[PDB]
Nucleic acid binder design. Structure first.
Ligand SMILES: [Mg+2]
Lengths: 120, 43, 48, 112
RNA sequence: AUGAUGAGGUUAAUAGGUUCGAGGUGGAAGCAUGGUGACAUGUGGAGCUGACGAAUACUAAUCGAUCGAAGACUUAAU
RNA sequence: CGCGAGCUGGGUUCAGAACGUCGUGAGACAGUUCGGUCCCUAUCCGUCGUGGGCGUAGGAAAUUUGAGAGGAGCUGUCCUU
RNA sequence: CAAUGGUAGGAGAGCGUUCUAAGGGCGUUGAAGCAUGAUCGUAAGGACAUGUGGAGCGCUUAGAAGUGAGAAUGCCGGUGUGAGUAGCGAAAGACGGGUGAGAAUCCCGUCCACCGAUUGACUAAGGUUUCCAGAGGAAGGCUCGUCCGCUCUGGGUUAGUC
RNA sequence: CCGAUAGUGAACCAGUACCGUGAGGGAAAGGUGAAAAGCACCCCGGAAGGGGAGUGAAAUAGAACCUGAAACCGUGUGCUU
RNA sequence: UUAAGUUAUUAAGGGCGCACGGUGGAUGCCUUGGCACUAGAAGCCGAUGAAGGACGUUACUAACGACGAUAUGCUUUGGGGA
């Protein structure tokens, strides 16, 4: 597994942040290496959401951030609720995958490979 | 570390400065030299 | 630790014969006809 | 038969810009533009501006087709460097050259 | 180190994911029972599990580009 | 008395202090004693590893011979005779 | 017919540079400088041609010298080499939206993180407009910059008791 | 007698930028063109720059502006490796 | 066709010559300013407040001159002629 130029605690925090953000937004722009690493994390989250039981929910709460989503009609729910209530339903028949990576060119401030990582 | 020149307005105007220079003959010498040179600042 | 002599112009230009960049790995985009980076999204159109 | 464009005193070191300028010498205008837009060096947008200016000069001043146009020659020579300094250890100051470049691109239809 | 080397690019098991294991840990969570309570027992070798083994195209190797021969003379055997 | 741009810094050879001794003294002794800043981003040859170019008279894939080169090269005890 | 290696060193003859005197000349039909050339003399060095340049300059004889540079760890300037090398100055960021020609770097939001006898709040010295608001991005910010302690324009400090 | 490294330190807002706590120390920096006639308009570009057009005898006289050496940096090639 | 022998071509880059550019500010030409003198004035100024400054003053507004609150100047006499 990659190190991403970061200590173990900082890498863990950054990966769970990136996972939560992809869950909230359904698609994010980031670096290639970080997307290659967050793919596994978010996909294991969707796997836990697909089981749906309480122990699995308690386990997925270990990784997700306490973030709030405002739906339409002023509907409000957490990232955990979105994981177990809308995204698990979207992938009940799919047996892996769950994410796609679209390489984009190098950014300007570095030569960093910017990528879109989305949900599928 | 503590360097030299800890500035202080009172001490600067008391040790140097017009009234201190005018209080001795040698101080008046330095003002005369600076005026002779065309110096814009005397003390 | 420190150079003993100059580096002549000949020696310098010999040393930097391999100091160059390569052309991008680019391909024409099938949808829009403009050049793009292979395995990257066409930035002019946004396809594939 | 020939069109010119010069960008003078570009605040990029000519040794750095000549790397990108080595890629488009003698190439077709379309391929040159694609190379410039896809290479990730600081000098690529600056050279692209000069290329587009030369192409516009061709079209507007001489009425030549910008489909038969090749990058006849492309070079950068030195401009008036700016002299700066960096405070190093023990009170010493080391010089810094911020060099500048005169970038020239001429395009041609390769005829007479 | 980077080049390089080697395994692969859909007519595909290369990596990820998913599923099944090996090894490791040592008995999850939620309930139920017992105890005044700290706790204990049961459900139940349970749960979890980087890198190791297998299967599976679900995701990414989906489009395409570039380089790369036509084989010199002389003599002798043929 | 190989090797400090590879290391150390105990001895030795600055500035401090002290003992014996010498000098009227300032000070001195190859007599002791305690303490006392070891800088340098490697240009060239050289060396250890790794790539590209061209050549090897067509263009390639693989398997090779070995001109040469390097490496290894030590030795104990016990039993039997 | 004879002589002609040469250092310290002696002697002689000359080449150029600036200026002055007198004579004689050349110049916008293009002077001096600069550049190039396959030209001439025994050397110092002298011409010619053609480009550049755009107003001054040779020649003769003779007078004066701030009269000739490759070296002084020379002085002043310019430019290299090392080299696209060392470094980029203690530390945690991620993503979404926004603005722009351009965004890792500016603005907003959420989560995360660091200090908290303090990285918080006053206030002496010291500094002098850096303070605020609009606009800006040449230079300065060790990168970037749409931003700033930078640039521009216009503002801002109220005491009988401090 | 000097003609911008000379001649005053200072031909130019000079005893000034700047240095120092202070006495003190002390620079660097002249030249478009005869006339500003200082490039109206078009085009690329956010701008900077540029290419046309035009002014001018001349615009590689375009404001860093007379001439424009050498070092140094590039781009093409004839002959070579 | 095979054997034996011989010799190209290559230029990643480099070298020399040439051509065209850039940088840079030598050189030439020039003078705003200096340097050394000659002849002739003159050889002090201040409590009637000097020498040097500070701060102001313009229609707008920085800096140099010029001038003080009568302030980018007032009166007078004499030149002076758009
Ligand atoms: Mg210091």
């Amino acid at each position: 597994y990659r190190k991403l130029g970061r200590t173990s605690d900082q890498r863990k925090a950054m990966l769970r942040d990136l996972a939560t953000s992809l869950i909230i937004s359904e698609r994010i722009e980031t670096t290639e290496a970080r997307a290659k690493e967050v793919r596994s994390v978010v996909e294991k989250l969707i796997t836990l959401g697909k089981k749906g039981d309480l122990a699995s929910r308690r386990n997925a709460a270990k990784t997700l951030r306490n973030v709030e989503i405002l739906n339409e009609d002023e509907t409000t729910q957490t990232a955990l609720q979105k994981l177990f209530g809308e995204i698990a339903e979207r992938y009940t028949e799919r047996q892996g995958g769950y994410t796609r990576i679209l390489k984009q060119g190098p950014r300007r401030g570095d030569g960093a490979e910017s990528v879109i990582i989305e949900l599928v | 570390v503590k360097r030299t020149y800890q500035p202080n307005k009172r001490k600067h105007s008391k040790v140097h400065g017009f009234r201190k220079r005018m209080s001795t003959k040698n101080g008046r010498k330095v003002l005369a030299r600076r005026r002779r040179k065309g110096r814009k600042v005397l003390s | 630790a420190v150079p003993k002599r100059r580096t002549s112009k000949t020696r310098k230009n010999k040393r930097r014969t391999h100091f160059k960049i390569s052309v991008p790995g680019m391909t024409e985009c099938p949808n829009c006809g403009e050049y793009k980076l292979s395995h990257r999204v066409c930035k002019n159109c946004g396809s594939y | 038969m020939e069109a010119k464009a010069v960008a003078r005193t570009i605040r990029i070191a000519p040794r750095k810009v000549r790397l990108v300028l080595d890629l488009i010498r003698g190439k077709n205008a379309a391929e040159a533009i694609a190379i410039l837009k896809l290479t990730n060096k600081a000098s690529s947008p600056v050279i692209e501006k000069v290329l587009m200016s030369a192409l516009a000069n061709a079209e507007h001043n001489y009425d030549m087709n910008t489909d038969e146009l090749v990058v006849k020659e492309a070079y950068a020579n030195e401009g008036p460097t700016l002299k700066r300094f960096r405070p190093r250890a023990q009170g010493r100051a080391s010089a810094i050259n911020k060099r500048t470049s005169h970038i020239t691109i001429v395009v041609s239809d390769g005829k007479e």
